Write a protein that binds this ligand. Structure first.
Ligand SMILES: Nc1ncnc2c1ncn2[C@@H]1O[C@H](COP(=O)(O)OP(=O)(O)NP(=O)(O)O)[C@@H](O)[C@H]1O
Length: 369
């Protein structure tokens, strides 16, 4: 006769944080509502377990933490605190304290509520302002999806979950539904256009919330749900399949970017087909709206609409705030680099320095230098 309210049990955090309840979960973390006595505010606390088993996963959480700690924007979720581990040399857990948000787009999409088109617009624009800041800081998030676009009741969007981000120069559930084809196809280089693609996918799901497109909330679906999310060739073949089913086999101009012969030949062996007509799928929105949607979802990363053009797109004139597009921020420097293979030792050092940024007096063990 166990109590389900024993989900709070595993969460051990300094006494100034009062754990209230569970709010959300992903493939890596469970996150909890908590009240902070010292700051007088609600916060979110992400707990990540088993964090040195796999070192690729370890690096992931370091990247998430180091990025958010060096970002300063109302459109990116704030890093409120990092809790000192009790065992500084052998800790396998980490408590990440974040600015709280009311919700997230994945939750909204499941709720039995309908949005107006102004809502859709307000939200997409807010998302794009966030992506702009990510760009101007010389980062590509690389894994934008409904789960990591947090939402507040006033329609403001806060981006999170930067563990897959890259800089501009075990087994888990893995969602490939918002991945750009170039990424699916594993091409050498890529730009922020990768985040615009993801934005297009999200936009389709924002469009689903209008009653005139979908009368019954039960039946809102992602645009590209091809890949299976549970544990390279087959998963990506299905994800590439469904993308072509929607936007079409690509034309020759789109294939000129590609470097490797075998990839072109892989592509070319998907039977030629035309897209769906998205105007017919989303037939309550203007031709401008559909233009914005179709521009974000171009196979050609080069022809895909840019952040700046999406912000200034006529479909969003009604909500645009050119005042907020113009800000000044520098390219952040991360305390490690993408290529760097790093030891447990070295990764524990960098964690503790970040934790030290929030806790001035923390002393890093000599063993970890
Ligand atoms: N600051 C926050 N405020 C409120 N809810 C949050 C916050 N951060 C995360 N959540 C909720 O927790 C979920 C998981 O967060 P996320 O950062 O994706 O965890 P993760 O497992 O570490 N990353 P992923 O596996 O890519 O989802 C989100 O989809 C939200 O429902």
């Amino acid at each position: 006769l166990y109590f389900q309210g024993a989900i709070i049990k595993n969460v051990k955090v300094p006494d100034n944080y009062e754990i209230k309840h569970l709010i959300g979960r992903g493939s890596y973390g469970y996150v909890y509502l908590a009240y902070d006595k010292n700051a007088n505010k609600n916060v979110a606390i992400k707990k990540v377990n088993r964090m040195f088993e796999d070192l690729i996963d370890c690096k992931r959480i370091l990247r998430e933490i180091t990025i958010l700690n060096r970002l300063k924007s109302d459109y990116i979720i704030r890093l409120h605190d990092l809790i000192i581990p009790e065992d500084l040399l052998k800790f396998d857990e980490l408590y990440i304290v974040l600015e709280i948000a009311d919700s997230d787009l994945k939750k909204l999409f499941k709720t039995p509520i309908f949005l107006t088109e102004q809502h859709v617009k307000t939200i997409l624009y807010n998302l794009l302002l966030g992506e702009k800041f990510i760009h101007e800081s010389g980062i590509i998030h690389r894994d934008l999806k409904p789960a990591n676009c947090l939402l507040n009741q006033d329609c403001s969007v806060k981006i999170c979950d930067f563990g897959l981000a890259r800089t501009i120069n075990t087994s888990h559930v893995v969602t490939r539904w918002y991945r750009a084809p170039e990424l699916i196809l594993l091409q050498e280089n890529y730009t922020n256009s990768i985040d615009i693609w993801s934005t297009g996918c999200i936009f389709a799901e924002l469009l689903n919330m209008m009653k005139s497109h979908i009368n019954n909330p039960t039946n809102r679906f992602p645009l590209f749900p091809g890949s299976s999310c549970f544990p390279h060739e087959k998963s990506n073949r299905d994800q590439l399949n469904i993308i072509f089913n929607v936007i079409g086999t690509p034309p020759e101009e789109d294939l000129k970017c590609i470097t490797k012969q075998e990839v072109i030949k892989y592509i070319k062996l998907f039977p030629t087909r035309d897209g769906i007509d998205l105007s017919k799928k989303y037939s309550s929105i203007s031709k401008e709206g559909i233009d914005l949607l179709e521009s974000m979802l171009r196979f050609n990363a080069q022809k895909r609409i840019t952040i700046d053009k999406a912000l200034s797109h006529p479909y969003l004139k009604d909500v645009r705030k050119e005042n907020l597009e113009n800000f000044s921020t520098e390219k952040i420097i991360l305390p490690f680099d993408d290529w760097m293979v790093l030891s447990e030792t070295q990764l524990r050092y960098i964690f503790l320095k970040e934790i030290q940024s929030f806790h001035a007096d923390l002393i890093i063990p000599a063993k970890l230098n």
